[PDB]
Design a protein around this ligand. Structure first.
Ligand SMILES: O=C(COP(=O)(O)O)[C@H](O)[C@H](O)COP(=O)(O)O
Ligand SMILES: O=C(COP(=O)(O)O)[C@H](O)[C@H](O)COP(=O)(O)O
Ligand SMILES: O=C(COP(=O)(O)O)[C@H](O)[C@H](O)COP(=O)(O)O
Ligand SMILES: [Mg+2]
Ligand SMILES: [Mg+2]
Ligand SMILES: [Mg+2]
Lengths: 465, 107, 149, 465, 465, 107
């Protein structure tokens, strides 16, 4: 029972415990921290831990009517980043008692709430998160997960194929449904709403839902395969989102889509619980992710948001195509794809896995490769993501010269040839062009697609490596 | 420009040319190498809504050779010649079907 | 009624309208844009406008069964930032028709959805937003506001 | 900060701003004003503006605890009407701040509330209304609109055809449904309830709904075309209207009808929101319109009510046939049909468009030509309204000598021949009788219809020109 | 069993029964009819009856599968109006079987639906309506009525006093409530919302309700008299109207206001049933009445709308002050005030009572005199309307030089002096100025009010006599 | 008096005599003059509930002559002789179908 000392004091005195070993129930956070010149790194990390768990700028007498050491966040390690004058990885451990059970929102509010704007800090990035098994158990996780989804849509042995209807905004509901039908009847498993398509004057959401459902029924009747369309239920309010989800259920739709960042984690968890309660698959679009996760020195790395989306709930999630029009490094993407899909992922700094993460049988999330890809990227994607993934060709299907259906067929043939050659024992990363070439010799739609997009390739500097 | 024809499909490996028994042999070899348990299922129809086909005998749990699976497949072909016949691969680590291709159409 | 040209083409052809004056019902966005070296700034801004409103990487034939010019986002101005080798403020105008009434979520998903991760872009900041009165009217706003509070 | 002057003062001092230019967010009203002899016209218009926005007869001290100039309605123009000793068009501008968002009822209560009974006024007519885009955005508009309706009923390239079952009141529910079936199987797209048919002792509404739904199913099965029947859900209370609408939805009916004036705008907006929420088309009957809009010197012109119905919600609306048994001039009807159907309508005094009206992608409303028309009026109507319209032949179908179905077929053949000749490049207004004559040479039902109604024609003085 | 004659025929053959005597269960309508030159008057009246009950322009074969004579409306009398070349009063009788029980909307849709726009008609006015007792019994009537209202507010022996808060639009919710408090604490029984005040950006309805309720409680605590404020629940939709009514009930408000014409009769009947079910008084504002009822030659006379409002439901209704800023003749106003308040009103053409109306114990509606009145009109109003009325001084209270409360007191003193002198046996119509003068000698607030408004007087030509 | 027969209809321009290829040519010419994009759709049935037929190739966006549309129509006829074939006109200003008539019944 100590006395009360009014006045400010250094954070490092009570928030930097370099000898402390993490309990297995702790939440572990890795921070890429760049302090101001002349600010001690350990003091900066102690400020991060204090303002993220319990610390205030000055001493408060109400700290004494408590056991502070059982709630305080502690920075148990600081190690300089290679090739950095003022950039360090700080490992901060938070007691399990600090966080509301089953709330991703509360976890993020505690972790990334206000420490990123600390004046003594120049830049802060949340690289990784160790979610303890005891905390994982309090979440629903994905409404279904990879294996239950594959069982429900009766699709095995290959990546799924999807497409976004283009243009993003402008199409009427009926023409939208016609494009959906033409894409689906060509061989695509899924079609999807653009993340901007919610309910607009040119296209009311109810008309879109009706016409899309009709196109799905027609293409399912034709091909004899389960067809789906991710219906964007993202809305202004939770009531509107729930109405859109309920109508999608009424139209016997198997899957709905949500933007978990612009929509928010509260609404995302609401929708995930609803999806589990009504047998609806949940595709998750990561719109606005690059606002947070693009820079190396500041923000939140997408693996943290991916763990949080896995816990909050989602059957699919966009992960970046590596080889497409949007930025994502190969190694980090492999890391967070394993984080999203696997049950146990061991520590690996080379892939951005700063902590060993155990999911305690929380089902995995399907990886979605979308953005600026065509048939030529098909082998590499099959090499990168494997079967438990969705490959999305928006412009790579509708942009085919012959139309939506021939482009869908060209993508399906490229995918099936890649899967066949992979199963037979071929080196896809080596003979991908060879497989595509023989398939083109057999497939005219594929031949036209490949001759159209042969010299299309997005390569730039990797800002996030 | 060419209009896509209306053909009924049968899930994985259906948008490829007619499957030679050699390519089928390689597919079953692949599922044996991965540790998948092969099984032969059959059904009178191939409706997508149907979750379950009818199992032919039991899954080849003790199988180690592709010829044994081919023997089950041809036995199903002989017994049911007007049935869709497919070969499935059960992955038991994750408990999910990992391979599924049709080997026979009603003849 | 134009024909259908399958294949990729520059964004600047149909998404950079430097002569266009903003309608009073448009949503105006100011972007601090840092493109990759060797990427034209105007092409970078056109990519921002296209991927934020309607553009895809290649041409889609469904663009023709529409009036594209009434929905396309247009970059109507690019001005270099002082003391910056590769940083420009781009002013992009979006038709009021693109956005769901009363939905901040939809506005942000359209604006800041995926353009911030464009490979040809090095850094992007959304500095300011002009919300037209017609769009403002579709929101409730504060439940009470300062004076009622 | 002025002092408080208790006592009456002229309205023109603070409500007549002839120099003021209208803001683009203002609501603009054109008033045909006839003041009492010896009442200054500008004072009369100032009284209109004051009593329609904020003015009271005497000065109130609570005006000072406000910014009056930001709410006051201003008469910014008065111009004498040609050939009128005491009739002037006054243009009054109202701030957008005065009106409740999304409420047609509040707009009308502010505008046409009590100024029409001003003692200093002899006659007042509200001719036109400029609804600013900012105000338009606060309304739902039509639940579907023209293009979504055409997509939903899968009907393109021609005006739709309908009929009111006659007699208006008296038929039993079963005989009503039989007449509906005979009309629909003959080629009519739609049948409809008379605006008086709500629920009567000779015909309960639930029995009518059941039998009509059965007739619709039978005729749809026979012809293979989408058949519909406007089910009048107009009721005594909103609960009863909602029950009737819900039952129409339960019977899988595509469209319901409402009287937006006798039923009211509150119930109309309720039903329009319900219709949007449940995918139901909304036919709007303008019963009691002529009580308000018949005289040139007093009332509200139907174009104002048409704009208000477009905002409150309706997929169809009656507009008058021009050439039928009910009064409506050609030019004014063309004007408000363009107002109801188009997105942008420029100022045109010659057609009664006193203001340029922009709808900001608010969907258009289908025009309904009903009342005293037969096949002989068919070319002119196709000339007047075009495709995006409904042509309703109540007595022109059931009054055919052979029966409901042959009369429906005669109307369908006349309509299709007119559309074909229009598409081919014929002058319908010139060779309408020629087209009808050749079709009669081919169609016996049409021949009997034309020989029955050859000398039937409603022409009188146009009171509203 | 007659045969079927396809073709048009005169309406007078089957719809003009000059020998028919009205059944006591019939609905009787008096129409001021001005036909086109050369149109027979009896044919015009037959067209009115036919198109208002069952008639179509041509003969329909479905008339035969019915008993037409039991549903057809019949014109049983036509008498020329004095001093009119082409204006006749036609008496049309409608069977009770034609109308939906308890629906004012259906009654008006049948009567005033489309006959007012008949091309053969130049002008039509619905002057009066005989509602049979059997039809009256199907309506709820006023939720409470005059006597139940007086019992509930514990106010006897005098007219009630009210005021509209001015300016109409512009005041904030808090200042609005302050004005309400100052008016109520001065002696006014009621305050009220302007008919335009529903929910605006400068004043949300919930804040207005809260502040008004607080002002009511404060003034009730101060004066020790039941204070009230008519809360405008008129809204865009029935759900919004019901939410506003429910909140008014939650705040323990005794009375709500509705615009039965701009809001509509469906919503009005809904609100009246709700008011009866929740013990809430219903003040009825007649906004937009003058659009319909201003002209002598065309429209619907306000007595018809008053009967319809009595049946649909309302405890108060505006009737016009006679001597104020809005138009209404003395005799016709006396007529429809007796129609609204009395149980039995005998036929009297001199007061516009074309039919003897029996209400079968349907409670009467309070008469509301509002618009351009001050203390000088107080005796005449007490002479005209008597006790069972509400006298509303919007500008006559807030426009008092000393403030809201002294003006309220001045009006209360003038009213109480007039009532006292009337009870004592004085001639109010003769010595009204005398009573006001002695009261001013005793009341300073009254003295200031009278000296302010001594020369304020609205007199013009009576367009509706 | 004559009883109306029971015939299945096919929307616009179905209650007119059998459409001569000349009148079809005029209809396609009309939709070309209005700026409508012509397209050829086909389906095995003509159920009213069916929102979508199957698109033959792509809409003739670059079309300027009726003979080209007639060539697509006859190509669809040759490929699908047991299919209902119709010609649609897309108005892109309002984005709504503006012409729709059947040109072929199952042979
Ligand atoms: O529009 C697309 C792809 O369409 P297209 O095939 O035309 O590129 C997606 O919404 C995002 O671009 C995916 O990327 P991300 O992973 O950032 O969400
Ligand atoms: O009864 C009819 C027409 O039937 P019919 O074919 O027998 O004339 C309609 O309800 C109105 O008359 C239409 O006119 P309006 O535009 O005034 O509503
Ligand atoms: O605003 C008022 C009166 O306020 P004031 O005291 O300032 O005149 C009322 O709403 C109507 O004018 C009453 O008339 P009506 O009977 O036509 O509704
Ligand atoms: Mg997208
Ligand atoms: Mg009618
Ligand atoms: Mg008022």
């Amino acid at each position: 029972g100590a006395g009360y000392d009014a006045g400010v004091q250094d954070y490092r005195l009570t928030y930097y415990a370099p000898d402390y070993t993490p309990r297995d129930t702790d939440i572990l956070a890795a921070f890429r921290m760049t302090p101001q010149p002349g600010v001690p790194p350990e003091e900066c990390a102690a400020a991060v831990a204090a303002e993220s768990s319990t610390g205030t700028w000055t001493t408060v007498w109400t700290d004494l009517l408590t056991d502070m050491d059982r709630y305080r966040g502690r920075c148990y390690d600081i190690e300089p980043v290679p090739g950095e004058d003022n950039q360090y990885i700080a490992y901060v451990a938070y007691p399990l008692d600090l966080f509301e059970e089953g709330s991703v929102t509360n976890l993020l509010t505690s972790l990334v709430g206000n420490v990123f704007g600390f004046k003594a800090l120049r830049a802060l990035r949340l690289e990784d998160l160790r979610i303890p098994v005891a905390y994982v158990k309090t979440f629903q996780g994905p409404p279904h997960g990879i294996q239950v989804e594959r069982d429900r849509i009766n699709k095995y042995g290959r990546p799924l194929l999807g497409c976004t209807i283009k243009p993003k905004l402008g199409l009427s509901a009926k023409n939208y449904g016609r494009a959906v039908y033409e894409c689906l009847r060509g061989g695509l498993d899924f079609t999807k709403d653009d993340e901007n398509i919610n309910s607009q004057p040119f296209q009311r959401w109810r008309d879109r839902f009706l016409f899309v459902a009709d196109a799905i029924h027609k293409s399912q009747a034709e091909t004899g395969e389960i067809k789906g369309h991710y219906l964007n239920v993202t809305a202004a309010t939770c009531e509107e989102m729930m109405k859109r989800a309920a109508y999608a259920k009424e139209l016997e739709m198997p899957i709905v889509m949500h933007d978990f960042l612009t929509g928010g984690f509260t609404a995302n968890t609401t929708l995930a619980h609803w999806c589990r309660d009504n047998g609806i698959l949940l595709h998750i679009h990561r719109a606005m992710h690059a606002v947070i996760d693009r820079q190396k020195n500041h923000g939140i790395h997408f693996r943290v948001l991916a763990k949080c989306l896995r816990m909050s709930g989602g059957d699919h999630i966009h992960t970046g195509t590596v080889v497409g029009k949007l930025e994502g490094d190969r190694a980090g993407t492999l890391g967070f794809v394993d984080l999203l899909r696997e049950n146990y992922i061991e520590q690996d700094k080379s892939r951005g896995v700063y902590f060993t993460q155990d999911w305690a049988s929380m089902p995995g999330v399907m990886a979605v490769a979308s953005g600026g890809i065509h048939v030529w990227h098909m082998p590499a994607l099959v090499e990168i993501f494997g079967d438990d993934s969705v490959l999305q060709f928006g412009g790579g299907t509708l942009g085919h010269p012959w139309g939506n259906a021939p482009g869908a067929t060209a993508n399906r043939v490229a995918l099936e040839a890649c899967v066949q050659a992979r199963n037979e024992g071929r080196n896809l990363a080596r003979e991908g062009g060879d497989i595509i070439r023989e398939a083109c010799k057999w497939s005219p739609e594929l031949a036209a697609a490949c001759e159209l997009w042969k010299e299309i390739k997005f390569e730039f500097d990797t800002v996030d490596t | 420009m060419k209009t896509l024809p209306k053909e009924r499909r049968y899930e994985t490996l259906s948008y490829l040319p007619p499957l030679t028994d050699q390519q089928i042999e390689k597919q079953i070899n692949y599922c044996l190498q991965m540790g998948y348990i092969p099984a032969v299922e059959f059904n009178e129809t191939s409706e997508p809504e149907a979750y379950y086909w009818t199992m032919w005998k039991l899954p080849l749990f003790g199988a180690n050779n592709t010829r044994a699976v081919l023997d089950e497949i041809q036995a199903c072909r002989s017994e049911y010649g007007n049935c869709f016949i497919r070969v499935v691969g059960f992955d038991n680590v994750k408990q999910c079907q990992a391979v599924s291709f049709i080997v026979h159409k009603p003849g």
